[PDB]
Design an enzyme around this catalytic site. Structure first.
Site, short mmCIF file in Angstrom:
data_model
loop_
_atom_site.label_atom_id
_atom_site.label_comp_id
_atom_site.label_asym_id
_atom_site.label_seq_id
_atom_site.Cartn_x
_atom_site.Cartn_y
_atom_site.Cartn_z
N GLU A 404 0.50 -1.18 -0.16
CA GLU A 404 0.20 0.15 0.17
C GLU A 404 0.84 1.00 -0.18
OE1 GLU A 404 -3.67 -1.89 2.26
OE2 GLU A 404 -2.88 -0.80 3.10
N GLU A 489 -3.55 -8.71 0.40
CA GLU A 489 -4.06 -8.51 2.37
C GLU A 489 -5.20 -8.99 1.31
OE1 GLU A 489 -2.20 -5.96 3.32
OE2 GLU A 489 -4.48 -5.09 4.73
#
Ligand SMILES: [Cl-]
Length: 803
Positions: A404, A489
């Site tokens: 991220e 994820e």
């Protein structure tokens, strides 16, 4: 010995009211300081602080500045040796001093680092003084970091000509081909440092042994010059006949012994464990290990060990990964930083695959004091440290350049992604690079147009990890037929062990007055999915390699969705709580991922007469019949379905991956009888109404442990009624008393909303249970744990320690 344990005889002090800047000086007076052994996390010993600069994100545990000092003499057996001081990890921004002079500074909190101190030590048994400043000024982290020298410390002692740090690279090129010819071709690259003051000629002997210590292969290099202060590079090939592959069921490792020869004499010896295995990510077929197709059944794991905080422990981390393996996990993602050497040892020995991940940020900072401010100068060093440390480990399948990362929408990010994959490939070209990317999620429904800079990064890595982006799984495969996609994820469903709230309500990022989350798979973050939905999206697609759920274990900090809600201080994301106690969703994953027949009922059976209870069964059986006090409440079954390419799975006609009843409550025994297609019973589960609390029951996971000062026994304390049934909402305070050859390392109950100490000798049960962690000392003997609670009868357990 070539590597010396350097964990003993340290002194520690936090900087609080007055500056400890003088503690670098040898003559500094540390006689008042605490005496301790490493590894050490100073944060986990502190009371929770609702005003902590760590905030909820760091679990309300202070960091700040702390100093370690060690006063030692050098044994005469070390004269004329090269000596290095090796830290496996210090969180974070440390400065190390020997005899009042800086050895260096090390920003990153999750890599090993080393200082050559050969010419800086006082020999002749004069006193040396090491001082380590640790600067965990907060906020530095989106999760609980811990503070201090939380991983092991060593000295490395060698002759002046020696195998370099990480100085071997063992590979098995074209193992698929070799293996069908009943062999493994073994390529060995060896780095020899000459740290003497004159050139030498050196040869390298490489001997491979099987796990029984039988020689299986041998090769001696050509001679090469190693000039003074330089490294010589060797490359040798040999063959293992009829090799044992490293696989999930048989995690077989050979041992390379490297002998450094000068004038026929051995001047150094160095060991490398490795495994022979091959694997593939295929754009259309997904993942395969040693030619066997399988999905990645993955979990994300943070580095804390619950009541131990960050302080590494081989048994604690092995226990976490054994529990994940019990859930049916075959793969781990080191979210979001290199793992400990103890974690690597566990995945190598247990048979688990690992994604190693360098970074939670590149230059754009997520938190003020994080690594972002260091990244542009240190990233090359840190990414190469990670790859060089782990390149021989058979468990490691992929190198993640980040999670991220905000920079990936910028041309600066594109340039950084090219640098990171180039730097990785300078150390290791045998494993795919990857990234975990959340910024294609878009509206969660339609295929998101990919940002041009993200698209160029997705072309730069070998394998594309999507975070929380189920809406893109098919679309990106169609639009980019060469991409290898997986869920880096997924889910981020939130749940409390033993809590059964809002049973028919599916709520997104919702807070409740109880400071808990529900274990009906019906609480999850607005960006996320139920466990079931994130699984279905993966299950249904052959091309999608698999997924890494957020998370396997709870960890300290990030109590989402309780952002500003002290005492909510630790996570709800885990399938298993910080204490190692499975939540109901653990059994949901078993039901989807494992073949051995099972059935698991929820909720508990302590309700009010007449009330309709939402009863679920997690099961990989065709059908289940539910019984209450011996009478059938009816059969529930699945359809035996097939994916588009014919993989079998069980789902109801209404799309559910579990079975369900609505049962008017009556006290007694609820029993689930799981049956195959033919009506044959293949598993059973029961839940009984508990009576009044009557006793504390203690159970040790291991009755015998090693008297080595670091081995652990994990003691479950349950609140039971007079018939031994766990009281499912019990919260009694349990007082522990330890006697004998051990110490209480910690207590826990996995309650995200508790600000009870982890470092204490008492704990409340949460949903019926608490944990005491017993650690051995160096003298063998017995350890006795007594556990009492007001108005109940006491529990007792004896642990034996062997020398
Ligand atoms: Cl290996």
């Amino acid at each position: 010995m070539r590597r010396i344990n350097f964990n003993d005889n340290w002194r520690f002090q936090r900087e609080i009211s007055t500056s400890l800047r003088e503690a670098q000086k040898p003559s500094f007076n540390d006689h008042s300081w605490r005496q301790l052994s490493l590894p050490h996390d100073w944060s986990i010993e502190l009371d929770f602080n609702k005003d902590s600069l760590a905030t909820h994100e760091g679990g309300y545990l202070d960091g700040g500045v702390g100093w370690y000092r060690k006063t030692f003499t050098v044994p005469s057996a070390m004269e004329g040796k090269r000596i290095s001081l090796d830290f496996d990890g210090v969180y974070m921004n440390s400065t190390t001093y020997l005899n009042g002079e800086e050895l260096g500074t090390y920003p990153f909190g999750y890599n090993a680092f080393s200082y050559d101190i050969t010419d800086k030590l006082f020999m002749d048994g004069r006193e040396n003084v090491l001082a380590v400043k640790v600067d965990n000024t907060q906020p530095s982290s989106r999760w609980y970091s811990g503070s201090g020298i939380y991983r092991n410390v060593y000295l490395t002692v060698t002759n002046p000509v020696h195998v370099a740090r990480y100085g071997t690279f063992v590979t098995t090129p074209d193992l698929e081909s070799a293996y069908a010819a009943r062999k493994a071709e073994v390529n060995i690259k060896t780095k020899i440092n000459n740290d003497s003051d004159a050139a030498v000629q050196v040869k390298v002997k490489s001997t491979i042994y099987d796990t029984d210590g039988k020689e299986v292969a041998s090769v001696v290099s050509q001679e090469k010059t190693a000039a003074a202060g330089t490294t010589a590079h060797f490359e040798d090939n040999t063959v293992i006949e009829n090799p044992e592959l490293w696989s999930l069921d048989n995690p077989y490792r050979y041992k390379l012994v490297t002998d450094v020869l000068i004038g026929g004499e051995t001047v150094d010896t160095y060991e490398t464990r490795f495994g022979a295995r091959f694997f593939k990510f295929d754009a259309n077929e997904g993942f395969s290990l040693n030619g066997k197709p399988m999905k990645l059944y993955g979990v994300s794991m943070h580095h804390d060990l619950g009541a131990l905080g960050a302080a590494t422990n081989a048994r604690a981390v092995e226990r976490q990964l054994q529990i994940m393996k019990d859930m049916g996990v075959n793969a781990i993602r080191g979210t979001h930083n290199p793992v400990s050497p103890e974690f690597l040892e566990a995945v190598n020995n247990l048979g688990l695959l690992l994604i190693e991940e360098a970074f939670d940020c590149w230059s754009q900072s997520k938190k003020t004091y994080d690594y972002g401010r260091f990244f542009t100068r240190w990233a090359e060093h840190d990414v190469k440290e990670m790859v060089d440390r782990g390149k021989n480990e058979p468990s490691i399948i992929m190198w993640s350049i980040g999670n991220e990362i905000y920079d990936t929408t910028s041309p600066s990010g594109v340039e950084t992604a090219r640098n990171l994959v180039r730097w990785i490939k300078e150390i290791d070209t045998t494993r795919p690079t990857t990234i975990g990317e959340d910024k294609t999620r878009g509206d969660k429904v339609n295929v998101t147009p990919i940002d041009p800079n993200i698209l160029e990064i997705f072309h730069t890595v070998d394998v594309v990890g999507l975070n929380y982006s189920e809406n893109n799984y098919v679309g990106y495969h169609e639009q980019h037929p060469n991409w290898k996609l997986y869920g880096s994820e997924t889910s981020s469903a939130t749940r409390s062990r033993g809590v059964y709230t809002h049973p028919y309500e599916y709520n997104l990022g919702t807070k409740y007055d109880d400071l808990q989350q529900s274990s009906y798979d019906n609480d999850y973050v607005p960006w996320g999915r139920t466990a079931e939905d994130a699984w279905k999206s993966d299950r249904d697609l052959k091309h999608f390699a698999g997924q890494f759920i957020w998370t396997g274990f709870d960890y300290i900090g990030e109590p989402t969705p309780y952002y500003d809600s002290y005492p909510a201080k630790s996570s709800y994301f885990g399938a298993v709580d910080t204490a190692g106690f499975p939540k109901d969703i653990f059994y949901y994953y078993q039901s989807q991922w494992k073949k051995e027949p099972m059935v698991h009922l929820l909720p508990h059976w302590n309700w009010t007469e007449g009330e309709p209870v939402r009863v679920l069964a997690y099961t990989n059986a065709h059908q289940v019949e539910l019984f209450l006090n011996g009478k059938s409440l009816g059969v529930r079954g699945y359809e035996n379905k097939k994916t588009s390419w014919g993989a079998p799975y069980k789902e109801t006609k209404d799309g559910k991956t579990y079975l369900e009843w609505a049962v008017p409550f009556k006290a007694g025994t609820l029993e689930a009888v799981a049956m195959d297609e033919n009506g044959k019973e293949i598993a059973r589960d029961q839940v009984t109404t508990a009576g009044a609390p009557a006793a504390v029951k203690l159970t040790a996971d291991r009755k015998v442990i090693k008297a080595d000062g670091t081995d652990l026994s994990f003691i479950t304390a349950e609140i039971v009624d007079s018939k031994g049934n766990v009281v499912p909402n019990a919260d009694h305070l349990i007082q522990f008393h330890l006697s004998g050859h051990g110490e209480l390392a910690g207590v826990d109950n996995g309650d995200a909303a508790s600000v009870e100490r982890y470092k204490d000798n008492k704990r409340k049960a949460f949903s019926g249970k608490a944990l005491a962690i017993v650690q051995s000392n160096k003298l063998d003997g017995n350890i006795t744990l007594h556990a009492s609670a007001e108005g109940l009868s006491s529990g007792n357990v004896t642990i034996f320690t062997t020398a």
